[PDB]
């Protein structure tokens, strides 16, 4: 049951951490991609 | 069954994390490649 709780922790940890990882990545990336686009769009503008 | 749930977690974790990894990479890269192109295209423009 300890090994279990250990798994339970390792899992909880992995889960909240999963959650954390999943989130951070999604937030970081999606947003990042989209904003970088702006940057490009503007560099463009600027050229003209 | 615990080892199983442990695998189930390790797997769930690996899965959502997989998902996370797969996504972030794809988003980060595809987008990144394409935008960097813009940059080049413009540097070009600028030259002229």
From Swiss-Prot, chains A, B:
This is Portal protein. Forms the portal vertex of the capsid. This portal plays critical roles in head assembly, genome packaging, neck/tail attachment, and genome ejection. Procapsid assembly may initiate with a nucleation complex composed of portal and scaffolding proteins. The portal protein multimerizes as a single ring-shaped homododecamer arranged around a central channel. Switches upon genome packaging from an asymmetrical conformation in the procapsid (PC-portal) to a symmetrical ring in the mature capsid (MV-portal). This change of conformation may serve as a signal for headful packaging. Homododecamer. Interacts with the terminase large subunit; this interaction allows the packaging of viral DNA. Interacts (via C-terminus) with the head-to-tail adapter protein gp4; this interaction participates in the head completion. Interacts with the scaffolding protein; this interaction initiates procapsid assembly, thereby ensuring incorporation of only one portal ring per capsid. Interacts with the capsid protein. Belongs to the p22likevirus portal protein family. It is found in: Virion. It comes from Salmonella phage P22.
